[PDB]
């Protein structure tokens, strides 16, 4: 019944969802992001938001579905494979985590805004390779 909202109202609804996320209100934030992912099928921020909420609630497989779609919407964003790699790790899937942290390092290395993440992705990758070996 919310279909057809203006961008400016979507923006305020994204703000609302982001704020609930910052306050650790993950169930409520998840619902707001799930709404926005229905309203706008292409805005990667909404899928990042939905993923992050599910991750914080321990719903790793559902977090992976959101991160996977998001990554299709912004092929340059290092957060998707990075947080996906965390979920794979918590699921005991070392090969998935290694792939994600590898991709995240490559995406983050190409962008100066993401210099801290690049180093984290490299650190996590090294940690995971150490466990497989």
């Amino acid at each position: 019944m919310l279909r057809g909202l203006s961008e400016d109202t979507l923006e305020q609804l994204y703000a609302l969802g982001f704020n609930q996320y910052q306050a650790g209100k993950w169930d409520d934030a998840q619902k707001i992001f799930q709404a926005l992912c229905m309203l706008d099928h292409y805005d990667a921020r909404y899928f990042l938001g939905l993923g992050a909420c599910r991750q914080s609630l321990g719903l790793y497989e559902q977090a992976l579905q959101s991160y996977s779609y998001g990554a299709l919407m912004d092929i340059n964003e290092p957060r998707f494979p990075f947080h996906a790699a965390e979920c794979h790790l918590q699921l005991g899937d070392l090969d998935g985590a290694e792939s994600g942290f590898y991709s995240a390092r490559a995406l983050a290395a190409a962008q100066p805004a993401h210099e801290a993440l690049a180093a984290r992705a490299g650190a996590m990758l090294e940690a995971v390779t150490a466990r497989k070996d």
Binding site: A15, F18, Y21, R45, L48, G49, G51, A52, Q55, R79
Partner: peptide
């Protein structure tokens, strides 16, 4: 945990 894009 995850760093989301700031709104406004």
């Amino acid at each position: 945990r995850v760093e989301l894009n700031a709104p406004r």
